[PDB]
């Protein structure tokens, strides 16, 4: 009978922000560690990646506040 | 039948943080030693590389704490 | 469900200023000691490193005062 | 029914200049402290970062004055 | 009955140069502040962004003068 | 599974302050002896090197006291 | 059929720490001797190069201890 | 009568990982040597190329482990 | 009738490592000599170039050992 | 019909090591003389430049011996 | 077919420690003699240069003993 | 309706040369004092900084005179 | 009815070289003053910026002379 | 009745090389001046732009000579 | 809502010249005492450091007088 | 009656490798000279261009050897 | 009727190496003089620029010799 | 109708070597005087700057002689 | 309409050699007096500074005579 | 048509060793005289400068003998 998109998109968000996003952020941190190992350590890389993680896990509240509710 | 990404990404993390990351850090230390041999010894290089190794092997707990759980 | 960045950034600050920053400052002092052992002892190095440590552990109050509250 | 951008952009500014910018400036100060610890202490780094913080928290009045009102 | 484009384009200009452009310039200044915080402070970035703001808010007079009237 | 940096940095400190720092200080004393043999004996060299050794082996308590705890 | 990286990286480490690293350290010592011949003899150069050699040949145990095992 | 793709793709993998991949890796090493000869020697190039070779010859086990079997 | 790539790539390697690579290394040594003549003599340049030559002429054995055979 | 690179690179080497390299070394010696005239006379400059000249004119035999033939 | 670096680096060491290093040490002694002729005779210069020569010609045994074998 | 850049740039100049430049020069003087406290007192630093302040507060008349009006 | 580009480009030049370029040069001088305040005073910066200003305000005569009329 | 392209293309060339190209070159010089004001002064920019102007105003003779007449 | 830089820079000055600068000057005096203890007592060091302290605590009035108000 | 492509492609090769390629290489050398005049002299540019010329004039023998005949 | 490229490319070379290259080299020498006036005098700049001029005016003979005729 | 570059480059040279280069050299001499006033007087600075001026005003004859005519 | 650089550079020279250079020389003399007060009186300092002043105020005639007119 | 570098470099050498080097050595002798007038007379300065002059005017024979012909 199909389901309304208000539940399918919410399922997508719950999946991408549940246990999957945790391991994705872990992989991001592993990536910045490896990039510091072989090369140069610059604050820009860590700042950008930590900001990306914050934006990923703040998407809910960022969307709630940016749209006035 | 395929497997859910919650296990595949975890397998990736376990591989990259198991016996492989050990030898990768060993190669990083060999690299900083060689860079000190032919050239100048600066605290910046060792600080950056040791920090990269710490970030690589702290990725799990860093991810657990940075996301509030 | 995600967490608001006002808590994630605070967690980052608490981690980087808790038991980790203590050992990081200890490593900085070990570094200045080693740099005095093999080489020349200059007030500039110790002044800069102690100032860096003070700025690291004063970041909270420095931010509170520099922004007028 | 949607909201006019004159309120959404203002919400963005209020969020980025409220409790979030405080901790962001705190992280910037932690960064300059860490950069002074492992390396050399130069007035350029602190000048640039403090100027960045001032520009971030002066954005409102800087915009009001630069546009003649 | 529709409206002539001489009023619709003027409405677009008035909207984009009224209260919206103010907050947009505020966001630009916040952006340059954040870019100075985590990274390097270069006169090029501030020069370019302030020039962009000037060109945005000078568009009316720039258009009046560049076309001889 | 990785380890939290609060243990890795502590391991670094324990290694650099255990049996390794002893022989490093021994090498420093050998160095000042050799520098006195072929050349001039100045109180500045011995003062600086002994101060470096004290700072290396006082790093723990110096860090505990400089940070108020 | 290919080989798992846990053996290839180990082969790299064994090669770089076997008979090759010996002659590389010999070349480093020849380099510091030549640098002392034509120029000035400073404890900093020898300290840095011997430390680089120690870090190169201690990479295995340094990696074992820095990672808690 | 044709053959099932489960054998054709396996033939492709066996060819690309047999005696051909050996000489391809040899060419990669020749390339990094030539790039070090005329230019600057950076750890990034060698790290990237050796990692590419490891990924090429670890493709089998990497695929076996990343897919949980 | 064409030839299998296992012979063409081998021909490429034999050409690039035969009499051509000798004169290429000779040109590299001429280059480092000229760079020492007009400018400053740094161990880094010679170390990097000699390492590049070694990697070029060790490509065969490096490939044989890095791949476990 | 073109010529094989084994002759073109050899022509390059013969040109750069024939009558041209002689006058280039003469210019290098003129340079070190001028640098001693207006400034300070340090053994490092002459050592580096004479070593550069030796490496330039020893490139042939250095290449023959460094490659085992 | 190329040669393994274990022989090329050994060839480098044999060349730099054979008949070439003898004349290089002779030039070093000529240098210290000339520096004593026009100027002041200090034990530091001779000590440093003789130590450099000893380190150059002791590189083999110094490397054998410093690495425990 | 926007404002002509002849007023916006003038507003920028008035802001940067009004009460803000005073405190900026005060910070510059504090900086040179701190640099004299921990380190060496050289006329070059004070000369450069006082010249920078003079150029900052002479920008108006310097621009008027350098352009012939 | 539109205007010929020979007048529009001339209007652009007159605007960019009239009262706007004056304040732009004033901002450039403020910039070099600020760069001298927090940092090092080098003749290169002032030379480059004054040359840029001269080229900006000499564009007319430079164009007249470079094109033979 | 239309005109032959041998006159229309010539009209295009005369327009683009008459009074219009003069002011275009003036704008180019203003551009290089502004680029030197806010940023770094490099010979490459001025060389490229002056070469572009020369090529623009030499197009006639360059075309006459490149085509043998 | 942010604060105007005329108050933030003033807060910076008040902090750096309040109770913090007192203890900083105390540390400077301790430094000159320690430098006199182990070494030679020269009027230059004390003159420079006392002048640095005077410039630090005279920054306000020095700025008021150097700028004509 | 047309000609077989085995002669037309050979004519193309003979033209592009006859008297035309000579002047093309001459233009390439003029280009690298001009690029060294206005800018920085880097071994990479000359190495790349000389390698391009060698590959252009070695195309015949490179094709003969790469294809096993 | 068109002309064969063997004459057009030769015309290009004759133009770029005739009276134009003379004044281009004159401009290069003016450039190195100006770069020595405002800044530091380094042998590298003059060496690179004179080498660029030599390569520009040696392009003919360099091409004749590098291609074996 | 455009002008041939043989006249435009000559105009550039005449401008840069006419009354402009005189005042540029005057500014260079003022610069070396100011650098001697606040700082240390070293023969290297004056030698380099006078050599730069000589090279600037000798560019014509230097170009005539370096190119054999 | 802009002004030719022959007047702008002359304005720069007139400003830097008018009433400004007088007070700059006065500051230089104050500097040498202060340097004699706290420290040692050496003829080298006064000779260098008076020579710097002479070169600053002789720049015009020095430029006129050094260039043959 | 260009000239071969074997004549251009020879022209450079003839110019730098003809009537120009004579006056350059005269300036060097004037420099050592002035340095003896205001300051201390040390054999090191005269030895170094006379050696620089000898090396400048012996460059031809030094190059002929150092290269075995
Ligand atoms: C647009 C706004 C600009 C604001 C800038 C004001 C900054 C003033 C600080 C002057 C710093 C000067 C740099 C310097 O020179 O290093 C000095 C520092 O040491 C100290 O005192 C360290 C203690 C300072 C702690 C102060 C805390 C500020 C927090 C500010 C939020 C050591 O000498 P190092 O020996 O220099 O010698 C190496 C040669 N390179
Ligand atoms: C078309 C219009 C153009 C307008 C441009 C005017 C901008 C003038 C600002 C000159 C900035 C110069 C950059 C620089 O050089 O960094 C300096 C800055 O520090 C400060 O003073 C920070 C305090 C400045 C706060 C001023 C606020 C402006 C708001 C403007 C709305 C530090 O030195 P960093 O040490 O340079 O050294 C690294 C080497 N790269
Ligand atoms: C066919 C007609 C062509 C006309 C073109 C004339 C345009 C001239 C403007 C030269 C712009 C040059 C670009 C540049 O280079 O950026 C500069 C600009 O900054 C400024 O001055 C900004 C203030 C300019 C405000 C001028 C307003 C023009 C309105 C024109 C209607 C900053 O440096 P960014 O640091 O470059 O460094 C990044 C490296 N990529
Ligand atoms: C986030 C974590 C950060 C951890 C950083 C701790 C590192 C502490 C090491 C301090 C190094 C300081 C650098 C320095 O200054 O060089 C010194 C070194 O010499 C030595 O002792 C060499 C022996 C050290 C061996 C120690 C082995 C560490 C392994 C660590 C896994 C020589 O003087 P060089 O004379 O400086 O003078 C040139 C001026 N540039
Ligand atoms: C949705 C899932 C996402 C998963 C992504 C995880 C990947 C993590 C690997 C981080 C790679 C970071 C890239 C990088 O930055 O290059 C580094 C790499 O070198 C290495 O360590 C090479 C050894 C790595 C071998 C690891 C094998 C993974 C197999 C995975 C199946 C070198 O530095 P190059 O010097 O960067 O500098 C050029 C500037 N551009
Ligand atoms: C995922 C796997 C990653 C594996 C990476 C391991 C690589 C370790 C090699 C560390 C290389 C460090 C680079 C470096 O820093 O250059 C050094 C090198 O010189 C040498 O010893 C050259 C001899 C090395 C020969 C070793 C042969 C490896 C073959 C490997 C198959 C010179 O100093 P240059 O002076 O740096 O200074 C310029 C500042 N940029
Ligand atoms: C992975 C392999 C690595 C191999 C590296 C071995 C290289 C050993 C050569 C040590 C060079 C050390 C550099 C140095 O330091 O310069 C010295 C050199 O002078 C000489 O002896 C010149 C004569 C050397 C001729 C030797 C010929 C090698 C050919 C090799 C094919 C001068 O002092 P400059 O005074 O330093 O002071 C400036 C401060 N920067
Ligand atoms: C992390 C590990 C650190 C290890 C460091 C130990 C090194 C100890 C050597 C102390 C060297 C001190 C330097 C110094 O000061 O120079 C002295 C040297 O002379 C000698 O004895 C030369 C004979 C030494 C031969 C010893 C061979 C070591 C091999 C080591 C493999 C001369 O005086 P120069 O007169 O100083 O005066 C100029 C003022 N700058
Ligand atoms: C194409 C045109 C070129 C024009 C260039 C003329 C510039 C002449 C100024 C020479 C500056 C020389 C730089 C220098 O060397 O710093 C000196 C400066 O101090 C002063 O006098 C500061 C007072 C100068 C105020 C003059 C105001 C000019 C406005 C110009 C509009 C300090 O010594 P710092 O001790 O050098 O030592 C560090 C070693 N790096
Ligand atoms: C195909 C034709 C090519 C023509 C090119 C001729 C250009 C010659 C100008 C040489 C410029 C050299 C660049 C340079 O090097 O910067 C110098 C410039 O300063 C000045 O004199 C500025 C005054 C020049 C005003 C001259 C006006 C030309 C108008 C031309 C129409 C400062 O040093 P910055 O300190 O370099 O140090 C940073 C390290 N990157
Ligand atoms: C099949 C035929 C091919 C023919 C090609 C010959 C072209 C040779 C011209 C070499 C151009 C090289 C490009 C370059 O590199 O830019 C240089 C140019 O400057 C100049 O001399 C400008 C003056 C040249 C005027 C010459 C007029 C040619 C007319 C030709 C009709 C500046 O350096 P920019 O600093 O590079 O640095 C940025 C890094 N990207
Ligand atoms: C373009 C404008 C240029 C202006 C420059 C004028 C500066 C004149 C000050 C001369 C300073 C000379 C430097 C020097 O030489 O140090 C002296 C200083 O001591 C003092 O008197 C300290 C008390 C001075 C307090 C004066 C306050 C100025 C505020 C100015 C706003 C100590 O000797 P140190 O023993 O030198 O010996 C080490 C060898 N290196
Ligand atoms: C599936 C098969 C794959 C085969 C690939 C093998 C190719 C190996 C050639 C490695 C080329 C590496 C590229 C490079 O990096 O440029 C180098 C090249 O210079 C040279 O040696 C030029 C001389 C080479 C002549 C060799 C002739 C091959 C014919 C082959 C038929 C210069 O440095 P540029 O300075 O890089 O710096 C710019 C940063 N981008
Ligand atoms: C696959 C084939 C590869 C062939 C490559 C051989 C090239 C050898 C030339 C080595 C060039 C090295 C580059 C370099 O390093 O610049 C040197 C050059 O100066 C000179 O001698 C200029 C005179 C050279 C004239 C030689 C003419 C070759 C024609 C060749 C046809 C200056 O120092 P700059 O001071 O480096 O310092 C800046 C730091 N970046
Ligand atoms: C492939 C060809 C290579 C050709 C290169 C030959 C160049 C020889 C010139 C040696 C220059 C050496 C550089 C140097 O070292 O600076 C010296 C220069 O002073 C002078 O004599 C200036 C007078 C020279 C005028 C000579 C005119 C050449 C025209 C050439 C056309 C000053 O000392 P600065 O004190 O060094 O100290 C700072 C430490 N960095
Ligand atoms: C890899 C090969 C290495 C070869 C190096 C051999 C070089 C030997 C020359 C030793 C030079 C030692 C330097 C020195 O120390 O300066 C001495 C020089 O004076 C002279 O005799 C000048 C006359 C020498 C003329 C000799 C001509 C060599 C040509 C060589 C082609 C003066 O004393 P300055 O008083 O030192 O005091 C300042 C404190 N810094």
Q: Which burial class, exposed, middle or buried, applies to G3 when counting CB atoms under 10 A from its CB (0-12, 13-18, 19+)?
A: middle
Residues with CB under 6 A from ligand 9: L 44, 47-48, 51, 55, 62, 66; M 41-43, 46-47, 50-51, 54; R 27, 30-31, 34-35, 38-39; S 12
Query: Residues with Cβ < 8 Å from E53, sequence gap 6 or more?
Result: D66, D67, E25, E28
Q: Does P65 contact I at CB distance below 8 Å?
A: yes
The CA distance from O13 to Q24, in Å, is: 55
Would you state the torsion angle of the CA atoms of residues A37, A38, A43, A44, taken in this order, to the nearest 10 degrees?
-140
CB M36 within 8 A of CB L49: yes
Residues written for chain S: 69
Which technique was used to obtain these atomic coordinates? cryo-EM
Q: Does T33 contact J at CB distance below 8 Å?
A: no
Query: Residues with Cβ < 8 Å from J47, sequence gap 6 or more?
Result: G38, G39, I41
The CA distance from K6 to A60, in Å, is: 59
The CA distance from R38 to R41, in Å, is: 9
Q: How far is the CA of M52 from the centre of ligand 10 (A)?
A: 9
Query: Residues with Cβ < 8 Å from S59, sequence gap 6 or more?
Result: R26, R27, R29, R30, R33, S13, S17
The CA distance from J47 to K54, in Å, is: 19
The CA distance from A50 to H52, in Å, is: 27
Q: What is the DSSP string of L1-62?
A: ----HHHHHHHHHHHHHTHHHHHHHHHHHHHHHHHHHSS---HHHHHHHHHHHHHHHTHHHH
CB interface of M with Q, residues 44-63, below 8 Å:
44, 47
CB atoms within 10 A of CB E13: 15
The CA distance from A25 to S59, in Å, is: 65
Contact residues on chain T for Q57, CB-CB shorter than 8 A: 2-3, 8
CA proximity to G49, closest of I43, F50, F21, K53? I43
Q: Dihedrals φ, ψ of E4, to 5°?
A: -70, 145
Buried b (16+ CB within 10 A) or exposed e, I9-28: bbbbbebbbeebbbbbbbbb
Count H helices, E strands: chain G?
4, 0
The CA distance from Q25 to Q56, in Å, is: 9
End-to-end Cα spacing for chain R: 31
The CA distance from O38 to O45, in Å, is: 14
Q: Nearest residue CA, atom 18 of ligand 13?
A: P48
Residues written for chain T: 69
CA proximity to R10, closest of Q33, N52, N66, M65? M65
Q: Which burial class, exposed, middle or buried, applies to M53 when counting CB atoms under 10 A from its CB (0-12, 13-18, 19+)?
A: buried
CA separation, residue L48 to residues L44, M40, P46 (Å): 6, 7, 41
Q: 3-class DSSP state for residue F58?
A: coil
- Give residue for tokens 């975890």: B10
CA proximity to N46, closest of N62, N30, N64? N30
Q: Which tokens belong to F40?
A: 């001039």
CB H56 within 8 A of CB H39: no
- Of residues C27, C32, C53, nearest to F66 (C-beta): C53
CB D30 within 8 A of CB C16: yes
CA separation, residue M30 to residues D67, J32, M27 (Å): 20, 42, 5
Q: Which tokens belong to R69?
A: 């005519």
CB atoms within 10 A of CB B58: 25
Query: Residues with Cβ < 8 Å from I63, sequence gap 6 or more?
Result: H22, H25, H26, H29
What's the farthest any 2 CA atoms get from each other in chain A?
56
O and L touching (3 or more beta-carbon pairs closer than 8 Å): yes
CB atoms within 10 A of CB M16: 18
Q: Dihedrals φ, ψ of D15, to 5°?
A: -65, -50
Q: SS3 sequence, chain K?
A: CCCCHHHHHHHHHHHHHCHHHHHHHHHHHHHHHHHHHCCCCCHHHHHHHHHHHHHHHCHHHHHHHHCCC
CA proximity to Q59, closest of P29, J11, T8? P29
Query: Residues with Cβ < 8 Å from R4, sequence gap 6 or more?
Result: N58, N61
CB S58 within 8 A of CB R35: no
| DSSP 8-state assignment for residue D6 | H
Q: 3-class DSSP state for residue R41?
A: coil
Q: Which burial class, exposed, middle or buried, applies to L69 when counting CB atoms under 10 A from its CB (0-12, 13-18, 19+)?
A: exposed
Q: Which is it for the CA torsion A27, A28, A33, A37, positive or negative?
A: positive
The CA distance from E62 to F3, in Å, is: 61
Q: 3-class DSSP state for residue C53?
A: helix
CB T44 within 8 A of CB K37: no
CA proximity to Q16, closest of J15, R56, N51, R64? N51
What's the farthest any 2 CA atoms get from each other in chain E?
56
**In which region does residue M37 sit, left (phi positive, over 0), alpha (psi from -120 to 50) or beta (all else)?**
alpha
The CA distance from B67 to Q32, in Å, is: 57
The CA distance from Q66 to P56, in Å, is: 12
**Contacts of A among chains (3+ CB pairs under 8 A):** B, C, D, E, H
CA proximity to F43, closest of O39, I1, K34? O39
CB atoms within 10 A of CB L49: 23
Residues with CB under 6 A from ligand 5: A 27, 30-31, 34-35, 38-39; B 12; H 44, 47-48, 51, 55, 62, 66
CA proximity to A37, closest of I44, G9, H25? G9
Q: Which tokens belong to K36?
A: 């004593």
| DSSP 8-state assignment for residue C58 | T
What's the farthest any 2 CA atoms get from each other in chain J?
56
The CA distance from H13 to F69, in Å, is: 61
Contact residues on chain K for J62, CB-CB shorter than 8 A: 15
């Amino acid at each position: 009978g199909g389901t309304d998109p208000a539940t399918m998109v919410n399922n997508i968000c719950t999946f991408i922000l549940g246990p999957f996003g945790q391991s994705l952020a872990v992989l991001g941190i592993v990536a910045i560690g490896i990039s510091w190992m072989f090369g140069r350590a610059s604050l820009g890389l860590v700042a950008g990646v930590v900001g990306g993680i914050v934006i990923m896990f703040g998407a809910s509240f960022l969307g709630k506040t940016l749209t006035g509710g």
